[PDB]
Design a binder for these strands. Structure first.
Ligand code: NI
Length: 145
DNA sequence: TCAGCGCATGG
DNA sequence: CCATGTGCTGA
């Protein structure tokens, strides 16, 4: 059994990014105090220019901040994203929270979507709760565990 | 614990 | 106008 997250009516962006933990965590950072309506389109623009942590760590933060300007929090995120992508590739880690820029919300997303620990996960984030609650209620109907 | 970050949108 | 949008770091 390998864990594959089901699609929910909430349409969390994590539901299509589960197979790429780096991209999922990048998405979390984009959603930090930022609406998904604004962040997600910019996310796709970012991902095409920086498809991996290899390219993102070798990136220049001025180009990234420029891309994050209409979202807000453009300067610090740009440096955070680069540093995170560097640590994700270098620093030995068991969970993404050990990395910089990722906190509880980013780490809970990982444990729910990227691995099967969603039973052991108790998220504080609102949208995560909705998906997490929707999970228990329908997991037997979707034949999950 | 908490200032700071930051622009857009609906109150 | 204030409040918040799928938060986190540093201190
Ligand atoms: Ni962290």
């Amino acid at each position: 059994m390998k864990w594959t997250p089901p699609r929910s009516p909430f349409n969390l962006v994590q539901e299509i990014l589960f197979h790429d933990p780096w991209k999922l965590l990048i998405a979390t950072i984009f959603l930090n105090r930022t609406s998904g309506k604004m962040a997600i389109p910019v996310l796709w623009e970012f991902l095409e220019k920086y498809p991996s942590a290899e390219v993102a760590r070798a990136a220049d933060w001025r180009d990234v901040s420029e891309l994050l300007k209409p979202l807000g929090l453009y300067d610090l995120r740009a440096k955070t994203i680069i540093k995170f992508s560097d640590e994700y590739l270098t620093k030995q880690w068991r969970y993404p929270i050990e990395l910089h820029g990722i906190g509880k919300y980013g780490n809970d997303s990982y444990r729910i979507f990227c691995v099967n620990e969603w039973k052991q996960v108790h998220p504080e984030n609102h949208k995560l709760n909705k998906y997490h609650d929707w999970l228990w209620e329908n997991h037997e109907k979707l034949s999950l565990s």
